[PDB]
Structure 1
């Protein structure tokens, strides 16, 4: 998949790095575009990788 996504506040202080494995943990926490692209690919998704 790749490097993954990062979480931030409006504070620009704390950032939380996510692995490509743990995307499906945060789920809807990502922006609606990320969710719309992500949800269909959960069918073919594996732990680190997409088939």
Structure 2
């Protein structure tokens, strides 16, 4: 999986950066379109890749 997603506050003064392997750790935050595209595949994930 490519570079992981990034976070940001409202005013965008702060921006966090996370890898792919941990997106399953913050799934509750990502948008729906990005979420519905991630949960059904979490099964096939091992660390940061997709089997």
Calculate the TM-score normalised by the size of structure 1: 0.92
Gapped regions of structure 2 (runs ≥ 5): none
Calculate the TM-score normalised by the size of structure 2: 0.92
Q: Distance in 2 between matches of 1:21 and 1:42?
A: 10
Pick the structure with more helix per residue.
1
Q: What CA RMSD, in Å, does the superposition of the two structures yield over aligned residues?
A: 0.7
- What's the CA shift for 1:19? 0.5
Q: Distance in 1 between matches of 2:3 and 2:43?
A: 21
Gapped regions of structure 1 (runs ≥ 5): none
Q: Distance in 1 between matches of 2:16 and 2:47?
A: 20
- What's the CA shift for 1:27? 1.0
> What stretches of structure 1 move > 2 A for 4+ residues in a row?
none
Q: How many pairs were matched up?
A: 51
